[PDB]
Amino acid sequence: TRMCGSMSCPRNGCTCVYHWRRGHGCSCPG
Amino acid sequence: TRMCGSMSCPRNGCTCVYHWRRGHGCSCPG
Amino acid sequence: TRMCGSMSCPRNGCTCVYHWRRGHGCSCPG
Amino acid sequence: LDRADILYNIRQTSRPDVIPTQRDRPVAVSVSLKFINILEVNEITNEVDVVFWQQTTWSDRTLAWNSSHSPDQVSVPISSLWVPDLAAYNAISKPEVLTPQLARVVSDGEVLYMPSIRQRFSCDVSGVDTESGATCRIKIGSWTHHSREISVDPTTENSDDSEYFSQYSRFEILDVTQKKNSVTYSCCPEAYEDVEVSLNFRKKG
Amino acid sequence: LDRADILYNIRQTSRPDVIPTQRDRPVAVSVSLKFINILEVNEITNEVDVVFWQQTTWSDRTLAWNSSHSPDQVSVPISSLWVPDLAAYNAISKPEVLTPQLARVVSDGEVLYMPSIRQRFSCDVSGVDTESGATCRIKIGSWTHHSREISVDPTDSEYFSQYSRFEILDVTQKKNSVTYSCCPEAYEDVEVSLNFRKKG
Amino acid sequence: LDRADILYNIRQTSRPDVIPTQRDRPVAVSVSLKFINILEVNEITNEVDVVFWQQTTWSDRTLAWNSSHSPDQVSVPISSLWVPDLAAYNAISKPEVLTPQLARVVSDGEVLYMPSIRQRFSCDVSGVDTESGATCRIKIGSWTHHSREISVDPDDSEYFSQYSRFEILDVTQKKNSVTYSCCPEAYEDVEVSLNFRKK
Amino acid sequence: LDRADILYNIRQTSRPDVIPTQRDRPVAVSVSLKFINILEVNEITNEVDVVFWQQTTWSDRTLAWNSSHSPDQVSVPISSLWVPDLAAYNAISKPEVLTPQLARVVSDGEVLYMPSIRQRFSCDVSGVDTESGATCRIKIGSWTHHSREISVDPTTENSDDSEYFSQYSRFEILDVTQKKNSVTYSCCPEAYEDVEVSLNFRKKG
Amino acid sequence: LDRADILYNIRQTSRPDVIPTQRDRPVAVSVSLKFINILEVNEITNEVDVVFWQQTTWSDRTLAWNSSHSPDQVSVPISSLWVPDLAAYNAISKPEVLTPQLARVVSDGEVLYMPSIRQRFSCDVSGVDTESGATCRIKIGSWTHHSREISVDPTTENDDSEYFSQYSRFEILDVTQKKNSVTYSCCPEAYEDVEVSLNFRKKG
């Protein structure tokens, strides 16, 4: 599935996000 | 008698309702 | 180098400003 | 007693964040909405802006005092008293209180609070321009309390379409109706009460 | 006494939430509206948007002082005194108070409160475009105190903005009684009649 | 205990600015939206103006009391209680709370808060005039707390105004967990999808 | 003294509800408006909507401290200080304060409060589209104090009229003038003082 | 320490009306705007209505605690804390804060406050309909403090960094943040601001 910057997403159906202090992230279902 | 879910309603001319925690209900006039 | 009123600006790329109480000033980058 | 003494006792006795149930029994609140004006209508959004006096009364007998050589009532800021947590369930704006935030306490423990309120409701506003008119429904009840804590009843009246309704308004009142509802669920022995006020109004020609 | 001492004594003595009735006469409140501007008028909706100074006065003898080396008046925040619970019976908006919330206490116990207020009314707006004009009524009185507790008495458009679209033909102020089916008692008010038209 | 005693103990025990975590474990907040009205829609600007009841619940066991011979619940002002710092991530207006700010506390420590809220959102909007309709998503989660502190978990038309210009085709509520490269903890939200059209 | 100590002393010494008259001489308040923007003009209502910085200063010598080995100024919330009860006599909206409500207190007791304010005034707006332009007059004075208690003077200043005026505004400033008035009655030996600010502006184009 | 203890200690000790100096160095405030949406634009009036997250951070060493065997952060109401008196010099409306007014306090004394704000500005806006777009500048600085009390710096600096809507009528071409330091011949201290430049255009 998704790579969001330096993050590999834990599952399917995930979208990308960036927080200015927490970094690149995956918004995941469930 | 008017029946709302499992409930028989106290009175006439009622009307059915559902509350998200309390369940099926009767809205009764007067 | 920029002169604002009687004031010589600390570095280059400064602009001039005038404040109603503080006088002529230099608005500088960095 | 003077007025200051009465207000002192009211503050000691009334706990604004505690319903004044006396033993088991519910506080009996009576409510009546008296329409003053219908202000703004929106064809696009189906919103109507309404001004009404919300006549509210209840008893807290622990506030009572002997009035024979004392004032028979006082006016009290509402922050010094418990007032019912009434709400219009189907309002689509917060209620703007237009008047001083004072209630009347009578020496027998009766409490009278009658704010003038401006508030938006959802309305069929195409029909405002028709002979039959539009109807605005306002459902009022306690937001958090059931019938064993607060009971809510329409006041008994002797009145009108109005002496309250502005004669300068663009609209006229065809009919006002007031019914009670009592909602009960199979879980619980208590009921949830509201008063439904229906305002049938239209534009004057 | 200095100003701080006066304010201190007022706070010790004043009960801001108790009407200062003395000896079962009504407290005599005098109110007069001085119009500053008329902003929006609507012949269709019968709404008017108005700015006015609400000159309010009354006596509270307990606030009086007579001491040597003292001011003749002080300005005090309204939360430090009782002020009448006046309301415009026929307002359709909340009053926007434009000015600092201060009252003037005179050493004889007279209180002067004169907020500048902006407020919308439901009003007879007929003939604003005519020579005779429109006449809009504003009814102001105590919201909770009936006529045995508060009385309302009225107390030359010097203050009206010359840049307004309207001009003031006449203001008249009469005294009256409101009653409604809610309440067994009657509430004194001042009925202010504002006769105004568009400038031509 | 009487109602006054219960309210007294609740005030002593509830710390409104302290999350009531019990040991290491998160406060489990459940949230669900009931739509009351959709007022204004804009296909051009993608703005929607919506009224909804936000059914919110959680537990604070330290509030609990013995309810034999006592009331089993009480109503409590929210200024006396911790409430979750929930926010709609994609709101474009401040939430106008329409109702009295009271919560229900049950004798076991359960808290029920259900404000009626009016709020504007940035939202898809397209096809509001079509059979299939438009779908507006509202994302609700804790503004400052992650999943080790707060967890967030989840009829239709039953309270939807009969005078609305729109009708509700479907509402769905799904959960998300967002994880970021800094931190092992997650940020939880509920995504509410409101599929509606013009009548 | 550190900043916390200064703020502590200021709170103990400042009486926010008491004018700091020293030996019953008037508190000298100086005021000047710097116009930042003119937003809306209304032909129909004759309203102008304006943003301005209200430079306000006065002295309260009781606040003073020795500033060797201590900070020479501090920033203090205005709720901790007496501020003059200034008002625009002819404003038709309440002033919306846009900025943090903090004043600067100098170790000698001088106070500088400069809120950015957005406010509507009544204006003759017909000539806004002409070469000569329109003029908005703003009359600012103490709402409750006369000249023996507060004096109000225009600050005398250099800075250009439009020195801080947004260049992206639809309007341009032709002239600002700031003059003093004293209104005096046969009733009283004291006067009521204001500053009359005249803003002469027009549409660009 | 548990969370309740930490919040208790924070309430004692924190002076919300005193800048938390530490050893008469300035409080270092870092600020950045992240744009979420652009709502109304007006070419005629040069007014723009914007929603943005104001990423703000600073340190208050007096809040610090030992975090072994304790939580490493807590959430704290901002009414319990000093917050910087930042203002947009060219705002024409009061900032509407849309989010819960809580900051994150780290056990080392760092404070992280990120309100979502809706605000109107007076701004260029001219080429909104062009490929190059319009640029709106927002100038942010301390309203009452100079550089020896508060220093204001842009946070180490990003773009449309996956904050901006996608349902907006506009798209973000670029956001840039530069610092200015204004100095006057009277006084040794400087007045600092951050200039945020939002380059955006209409889609289509």
Q: What is the 3-state secondary structure (H, E, C) of D27-61?
A: EEEEEEEEEEEEEEEECCCCEEEEEEEEEEEEECH
Alpha-carbon gap: G122 to the closest alpha carbon of chain H (Å): 19
* Inter-chain touch H112–A16, beta carbons under 8 Å: no
Q: Retrieve residue H182's tokens.
A: 């204004």
F20, F145 contact by CB (below 8 A): no
Q: G115 pairs with which residues across the strands?
A: none
* Inter-chain touch F179–A17, beta carbons under 8 Å: no
Q: Retrieve residue G151's tokens.
A: 């004096």
What is the C-alpha to C-alpha distance for residues D32 and G168, in angstroms, rounded to an integer? 54
Query: At F174, is the secondary structure helix, strand, or coil?
Result: strand
D12: DSSP letter: H
Would residue E62 be called left, alpha or beta, if left means φ above 0 and alpha means ψ between -120 and 50 degrees? alpha
Resolution in A: 2.5
D91: DSSP letter: B
Residues of H with CB under 8 A from a CB of G: 15, 17-19, 21, 44-47, 85-87, 90-94, 122-125, 143-145, 149
Q: Retrieve residue E130's tokens.
A: 């005519």
Tell me how far apart the terminal alpha carbons of chain A are, to the nearest angstrom: 15
Q: Retrieve residue H22's tokens.
A: 């530490």
Reference G148, options G1, G9, G25; nearest CA is G25
Task: List CB contacts of F160: < 8 A, sequence separation 6 or more.
Answer: F35, F36, F37, F167, F168
Q: Retrieve residue F152's tokens.
A: 């967030």
Length of chain A: 30
Q: For residue F119, how many C-alpha atoms fall within 13 Å in the half-sphere facing its CB?
A: 27
Task: List CB contacts of H82: < 8 A, sequence separation 6 or more.
Answer: H14, H15, H16, H17, H18, H19, H20, H60
Q: How far is CA D69 from CA D3, D9, D20, D110, E23, in A?
A: 12, 17, 27, 19, 12
Say which of F21, F90, F122 has its CB closest to residue H3: F21
Q: Is the dihedral of CA F86, F91, F92, F98 positive or negative?
A: negative
What is the C-alpha to C-alpha distance for residues G144 and E77, in angstroms, rounded to an integer? 11
H34, A20 contact by CB (below 8 A): yes
Q: Scanning the structure block, which residue is given the tokens 């909340």? A: E94
What is the C-alpha to C-alpha distance for residues E92 and D99, in angstroms, rounded to an integer? 11
Strands F150-153 and F27-42, sheet pairing: parallel
* Inter-chain touch F75–D85, beta carbons under 8 Å: yes
* Inter-chain touch A24–F181, beta carbons under 8 Å: yes
| φ and ψ of E8, to 5 deg | -60, -50
What is the C-alpha to C-alpha distance for residues G155 and D142, in angstroms, rounded to an integer? 57
Do chains F and B touch, with touching meaning 3 or more CB–CB pairs less than 8 Å apart? yes
Tell me the chain A residues in contact with residue F174 when contact means C-beta distances shorter than 8 Å. Answer: 29
Alpha-carbon gap: C11 to the closest alpha carbon of chain G (Å): 24
Q: Which of G8, G57, G168 to substitute to test the interface with H, most H CBs within 10 Å?
A: G168
What is the C-alpha to C-alpha distance for residues H92 and G98, in angstroms, rounded to an integer? 8
Q: F105 pairs with which residues across the strands?
A: F74, F111
G34, C20 contact by CB (below 8 A): yes
D33, D7 contact by CB (below 8 A): no
D97, D54 contact by CB (below 8 A): no
What is the C-alpha to C-alpha distance for residues D134 and D171, in angstroms, rounded to an integer? 10
Q: Retrieve residue E85's tokens.
A: 């619970």
G118, G49 contact by CB (below 8 A): yes
- Beta-carbon contacts below 8 Å between A and F: 38
What is the C-alpha to C-alpha distance for residues C25 and C16, in angstroms, rounded to an integer? 6
| Consecutive H or E run containing D191 | strand D191-203
Say which of A23, A24, A29 has its CB closest to residue F176: A29
Residues of G with CB under 8 A from a CB of H: 2-4, 7, 36-37, 39-40, 51, 75-77, 80, 96-100, 102-104, 116, 118, 166, 168-170
Reference D105, options D174, D30, D14, D37; nearest CA is D14
DSSP string covering F92-118: SS--EE-S--EEEEETTSEEEE--EEE
The total of other beta-carbon atoms located within 10 Å of residue H173's CB is: 16
Reference E55, options E132, E125, E120, E115; nearest CA is E115
| φ and ψ of G37, to 5 deg | -160, 150
What is the C-alpha to C-alpha distance for residues H63 and E121, in angstroms, rounded to an integer? 53
Residues of F with CB under 8 A from a CB of D: 3-4, 7, 36-37, 39-40, 49, 51, 75-77, 80, 96-100, 102-104, 116, 118, 159, 161-165
Task: List CB contacts of H122: < 8 A, sequence separation 6 or more.
Answer: G37, G39, G166, G168, G169, H46, H47, H90, H92
Q: Scanning the structure block, which residue is given the tokens 């800094």? A: F182
D189: DSSP letter: S
H64, H22 contact by CB (below 8 A): no
Would residue E158 be called left, alpha or beta, if left means φ above 0 and alpha means ψ between -120 and 50 degrees? alpha
Length of chain F: 199
Q: E49 pairs with which residues across the strands?
A: E40, E120
What is the C-alpha to C-alpha distance for residues G79 and D154, in angstroms, rounded to an integer? 45
| Consecutive H or E run containing F13 | helix F3-13
The total of other beta-carbon atoms located within 10 Å of residue H148's CB is: 14
Reference E115, options E182, E31, E43; nearest CA is E31
| φ and ψ of G62, to 5 deg | -70, -20
Q: Retrieve residue G67's tokens.
A: 């500033």
Task: List CB contacts of G139: < 8 A, sequence separation 6 or more.
Answer: G88, G89, G90, G181, G194, G195, G196, G197
Strands E27-42 and E150-153, sheet pairing: parallel
Would residue F133 be called left, alpha or beta, if left means φ above 0 and alpha means ψ between -120 and 50 degrees? left
SS3 of chain E: CCHHHHHHHHHHHCCCCCCCCCCCCCEEEEEEEEEEEEEEEECCCCEEEEEEEEEEEEECHHHCCCCCCCCCEEEEEHHHCCCCCEEECCECCCCEECCCCEEEEECCCEEEECCEEEEEEECCCCCCCCCCCEEEEEEEEECCCCCCCEEEECCCCCCCCCCCCEEEEEEEEEEEEECCCCCCCCEEEEEEEEEEEECC
What is the C-alpha to C-alpha distance for residues G29 and G147, in angstroms, rounded to an integer? 11
E31, E190 contact by CB (below 8 A): yes
Residues of A with CB under 8 A from a CB of H: 16-18, 20-21
Q: What's the CA dihedral at H9, H10, H12, H17 to 10 degrees? A: 170
Tell me the chain C residues in contact with residue H183 when contact means C-beta distances shorter than 8 Å. Answer: 10, 25-26, 28
G85, G194 contact by CB (below 8 A): no
Say which of G47, G89, G143 has its CB closest to residue E102: G143
Query: At C6, is the secondary structure helix, strand, or coil?
Result: coil
Nearest Cα residue in chain H from C16? H182
Q: Which of C21, C22, C24 to substitute to test the interface with G, most G CBs within 10 Å?
A: C21
**Residue G78: exposure state from Cβ atoms within 10 A (0-12, 13-18, ≥19):** middle
What is the C-alpha to C-alpha distance for residues F140 and F84, in angstroms, rounded to an integer? 11
Long-range pairs for D69-72 at CB < 8 Å and ≥24 separation? Answer: D70/D1, D70/D2, D70/D6, D70/D107, D71/D1, D71/D2, D71/D3, D71/D6, D71/D107, D72/D106, D72/D107
Q: Cβ of H116 under 8 Å from any chain A Cβ?
A: no
* Inter-chain touch H55–A16, beta carbons under 8 Å: no
Amino acid identity of G198? S
What is the C-alpha to C-alpha distance for residues D83 and D14, in angstroms, rounded to an integer? 10
The total of other beta-carbon atoms located within 10 Å of residue D12's CB is: 8
Q: Retrieve residue A1's tokens.
A: 């599935």
Q: E27 pairs with which residues across the strands?
A: E150
What is the C-alpha to C-alpha distance for residues H185 and C10, in angstroms, rounded to an integer? 11
F82: DSSP letter: -
* Inter-chain touch H161–A20, beta carbons under 8 Å: yes
Alpha-carbon gap: H193 to the closest alpha carbon of chain C (Å): 10
Q: Retrieve residue G204's tokens.
A: 């660009």
Query: At D165, is the secondary structure helix, strand, or coil?
Result: coil
Q: Cβ of H120 under 8 Å from any chain A Cβ?
A: no
**Residue E125: exposure state from Cβ atoms within 10 A (0-12, 13-18, ≥19):** buried
What is the C-alpha to C-alpha distance for residues E52 and E164, in angstroms, rounded to an integer? 13
Q: Cβ of H39 under 8 Å from any chain A Cβ?
A: no
Amino acid identity of G126? S
Tell me the chain A residues in contact with residue F182 when contact means C-beta distances shorter than 8 Å. Answer: 21-23
* Inter-chain touch F182–A28, beta carbons under 8 Å: no
* Inter-chain touch G34–C19, beta carbons under 8 Å: no
F141, H187 contact by CB (below 8 A): no
Query: At D83, is the secondary structure helix, strand, or coil?
Result: coil
Reference E25, options E147, E194, E170, E161; nearest CA is E147
**Residue G150: exposure state from Cβ atoms within 10 A (0-12, 13-18, ≥19):** buried
Task: List CB contacts of D187: < 8 A, sequence separation 6 or more.
Answer: B22, B23
G31, G86 contact by CB (below 8 A): yes
Tell me the chain H residues in contact with residue G9 when contact means C-beta distances shorter than 8 Å. Answer: none
Q: Retrieve residue B24's tokens.
A: 């099926």
Q: F15 pairs with which residues across the strands?
A: none
Tell me the chain F residues in contact with residue H39 when contact means C-beta distances shorter than 8 Å. Answer: 45, 47, 92
Reference H189, options F99, D50, C19, E161; nearest CA is C19
Strands D73-77 and D102-106, sheet pairing: antiparallel
Tell me the chain C residues in contact with residue G159 when contact means C-beta distances shorter than 8 Å. Answer: 18-20
D78: DSSP letter: G
Amino acid identity of H107? S
Tell me the chain F residues in contact with residue B17 when contact means C-beta distances shorter than 8 Å. Answer: 158
What is the C-alpha to C-alpha distance for residues C18 and C6, in angstroms, rounded to an integer? 12
What is the C-alpha to C-alpha distance for residues H170 and H125, in angstroms, rounded to an integer? 12
| φ and ψ of G115, to 5 deg | -70, 150
What is the C-alpha to C-alpha distance for residues D199 and D38, in angstroms, rounded to an integer? 10
* Strand arrangement, sheet containing E187-198: E86-88, E134-142, E187-198, E166-178
* Inter-chain touch G168–H17, beta carbons under 8 Å: no
F44 CA to centre of own chain: 29
Strands, E, within chain F: which ranges?
27-42, 47-59, 73-77, 86-88, 96-97, 102-106, 110-113, 116-122, 134-142, 150-153, 166-180, 186-198
SS3 of chain H: CCHHHHHHHHHCCCCCCCCCCCCCCCEEEEEEEEEEEEEEEECCCCEEEEEEEEEEEEECHHHCCCCCCCCCEEEEEHHHCCCCCEEECCECCCCEECCCCEEEEECCCEEEECCEEEEEEECCCCCCCCCCCEEEEEEEEECCCCCCCEEEEECCCCCCCCCCCCCCCEEEEEEEEEEEEEEECCCCCEEEEEEEEEEEEECC
What is the C-alpha to C-alpha distance for residues E90 and E30, in angstroms, rounded to an integer? 19
DSSP string covering F177-190: EEEETT-S-EEEEE
SS3 of chain G: CCHHHHHHHHHHHCCCCCCCCECCECEEEEEEEEEEEEEEEECCCCEEEEEEEEEEEEECHHHCCCCCCCCCEEEEEHHHCCCCCEEECCECCCCEECCCCEEEEECCCEEEECCEEEEEEECCCCHHHCCCCEEEEEEEEECCCCCCCEEEEECCCCCCCCCCCCCCCCEEEEEEEEEEEEEECCCCCCEEEEEEEEEEEEECC
The total of other beta-carbon atoms located within 10 Å of residue H36's CB is: 23
Nearest Cα residue in chain A from F139? A27
D6: DSSP letter: H
Reference D5, options F161, E15, H141; nearest CA is E15
Say which of B17, B18, B20 has its CB closest to residue F32: B20
**Residue H197: exposure state from Cβ atoms within 10 A (0-12, 13-18, ≥19):** middle
What is the C-alpha to C-alpha distance for residues D176 and D199, in angstroms, rounded to an integer? 5
Tell me the chain D residues in contact with residue E115 when contact means C-beta distances shorter than 8 Å. Answer: none
**Residue F137: exposure state from Cβ atoms within 10 A (0-12, 13-18, ≥19):** middle
Q: Retrieve residue D157's tokens.
A: 């009246």
| Consecutive H or E run containing D9 | helix D3-13
Say which of H91, H124, H143 has its CB closest to residue G168: H124
The total of other beta-carbon atoms located within 10 Å of residue H72's CB is: 10
Q: For residue G96, how many C-alpha atoms fall within 13 Å in the half-sphere facing its CB?
A: 15
